Write a protein that binds this ligand. Structure first.
Ligand SMILES: COCCOCCOCCOc1ccc(C(C)(C)CC(C)(C)C)cc1
Ligand SMILES: COCCOCCOCCOc1ccc(C(C)(C)CC(C)(C)C)cc1
Ligand SMILES: COCCOCCOCCOc1ccc(C(C)(C)CC(C)(C)C)cc1
Ligand SMILES: COCCOCCOCCOc1ccc(C(C)(C)CC(C)(C)C)cc1
Lengths: 143, 143, 143, 143
C-alpha cells in the first residue's frame, strides 16, 4: 500500500539508504540493547511512544521469523534449500530489522531530530568519494 | 523480551484466543478493508494513532514475507520445499497477521472498548453449548 | 525466592550481563581495592550505606566459599572431583562475586547513576562497530 | 578482612554464641517465615532496611550454594565426594545461614533491642546450671 515505516517518524527509506550494512550492529546486539534499556517499557501496557510501539511490532515479527527458520530446519529434507531460506531470512530480513531497530533505539536515546541530522551528515559523508572525504565517519554516541 | 502486541491496546493473546482461527477473515479481505478505509492515513506522515503505527508495521512485514515467498518460488528448486515454505508462511503467519489486522482495523472502526467487549461476548457465545447457543453470533456494527 | 541483588540499587542481572565476562577485574584485585579504600568502613559498626552492607555480606560469603575450597582440598580424595569443585567455585561464583564487587565498589567510588550510565554506554560501545564508535573504550576516572 | 556481619546492627558472633547451635530453626522453616512475612519487601526495589539488604544477599548466596549442590550431584560420579560436599554445605553453611536468618527475621519482627535483650537473657538462662534453671526459657513473642 506504499507505506514507509519511517515517514511517520520524519525519515525515509532513501535517507537510511546510505547507511552501509557494516554500520548496523547484529540482531542479537540490538535486541540486547533494547532488552537492557527499554525492556520494562516494551513489556508495559502503556503506549509509551510510537518508537516503543514499532519496536514491539518488529520484535514480534522477528520472533515469528525465527520460528519459521526453526520450522524449516526441522521440516525440510533438502539441506540446500533449507540453508538457502535461512540465509535469506537472516541476511536480508535482519539487515532491514537492524535498520529499524537502530533507527528507533537511536531516536529514543538521542532524539528524532538529532538522528535525522546525523543521517543527513552521514549521507553527505558517504556520498563523497574517499579521496575527498575525511577518513573518520560521523559518530552518534552518548560519550 | 516476552512482548504481547495487544497489551498496550488493552487485550492479550489469551483474550483473543476466545476467537477461533476459522473466524478471522482473509488477508485479502482485511487488506482491501484497510485500503478502502484508511489508505490516506496509513500513507500519512503522522502518528494518527498507535493502531495506525502497528498496522503500518504489520503491513510492511507482510510485504516482506510476500517478497520472501516470491524469492523462494524463484530460487528454490525442490518443489516440495518451495510449496512447504509458501504454505507455512501463508497459513500460519497470515493467521497471525489477520488476527492483528482484524484487531486494529476493528478498533480504528468501532472502538478499542467495543472490540474488547466484543471479545468477551464472543467468548460467552462460543463457550455456550450449542443446544442453547443462538445462531446469531455476535458481530460488530455501526448501526 | 525471586530476588535480584541489584534492583534496590537500580540495576539488574540483565544490565550487568550487558557487559562481557572478560571485563570484570579479578577477585584479588577487587578485594585489594575494597580493603585499601573502605576497610575501616566495612569493619565499622555503622550502616554507612547499603553498598557497604551488601559488600560485607558478599565478602563473608566468599570467605565461607574459600573455607569450603580448602576443606575440599583436604578431605576429598578424588583429585578429579576436587579440581572440578574448586574450578566451578572460582569460575562461576568468582564471576558473580566480582561482578557484584565491581558494581558496589565502583558505585561507592564514582556514583550509582554514573556506574549505570557506564554499563549502558560500554555495552552499546562494545556492540557498535569500530569504524563508527569512538576508538577508545570507556573507563571510570576520579581524576 | 575481619568483617563481622552483625556489628553493623549491634551484635557480634560472640553474642550469638550464647545460643547453642541446636537452637536455630531449619532453613526450610526460616525461609518459609520470610516468604510469609517479608516476601514483597525483599522482592521490592527499595532499601526498606539494612536487615532486608542483608537477608537478600544471604538468600542469593544460599541459592548459589544450592546450584552448586545440584551441579555436584550431576557432574560428580563419585558418590563419596558428592555426599561429603553436599553434607558439608547443608550442615556448616546451613548453620551459619540459619543463624543469620534467625537474627534478621527476629530483628524485623521484634527489633534489634528486643533481640539483643533476648540474647542476654537466654545467655543467663543457659549459663545457669539446670538445678537452678527455670523451665520457662525466654521465648520471643508479641503476646
Ligand atoms: C535487504 O535489506 C536492505 C535494506 O533495506 C532496504 C529498504 O529498507 C526498508 C526497510 O523496510 C523494513 C521492512 C520491514 C521491517 C520489519 C520491522 C517488518 C522486519 C522484518 C524485515 C524482519 C520483516 C523493517 C524494515
Ligand atoms: C499460527 O498462529 C497461531 C495463532 O496466533 C497466536 C497469536 O500469537 C501472538 C502473535 O500474533 C501476531 C500477530 C501478527 C503479527 C504480525 C503483524 C507481525 C505479522 C506476521 C504474523 C506476518 C509476522 C505477529 C504476531
Ligand atoms: C559451622 O557454623 C559455625 C557457627 O558459628 C558461626 C561463626 O561464623 C559466623 C557466621 O558468619 C556467616 C558467614 C556467612 C553467612 C552467609 C549469609 C554469607 C551465608 C552462607 C553461610 C550460606 C555462606 C552467614 C554467616
Ligand atoms: C557464571 O555466572 C554467570 C553470571 O551470573 C550472572 C549473575 O547471576 C545472578 C547472581 O548474582 C550474584 C552475584 C554475586 C553473588 C555473591 C556476592 C553473593 C557471591 C557468590 C557468587 C560467591 C555467591 C551472588 C549472586
Amino acid at each position: 500500500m506504499d507505506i514507509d515505516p519511517y515517514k511517520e517518524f520524519g525519515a525515509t527509506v532513501e535517507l537510511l539508504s546510505f547507511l552501509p550494512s557494516d554500520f548496523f550492529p547484529s540482531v542479537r546486539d540490538l535486541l540486547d540493547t533494547a532488552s537492557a534499556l527499554y525492556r520494562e517499557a516494551l513489556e508495559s501496557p502503556e503506549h509509551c511512544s510510537p518508537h516503543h510501539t514499532a519496536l514491539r511490532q518488529a520484535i514480534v515479527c522477528w520472533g515469528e521469523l525465527m520460528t519459521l527458520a526453526t520450522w524449516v530446519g526441522v521440516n525440510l529434507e533438502d539441506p540446500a534449500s533449507r540453508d538457502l531460506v535461512v540465509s535469506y531470512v537472516n541476511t536480508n530480513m535482519g539487515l532491514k530489522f537492524r535498520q529499524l531497530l537502530w533507527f528507533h533505539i537511536s531516536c529514543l536515546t538521542f532524539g528524532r531530530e538529532t538522528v535525522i541530522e546525523y543521517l543527513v551528515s552521514f549521507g553527505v559523508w558517504i556520498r563523497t568519494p574517499p579521496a575527498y572525504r575525511p577518513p573518520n565517519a560521523p559518530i552518534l554516541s552518548t560519550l
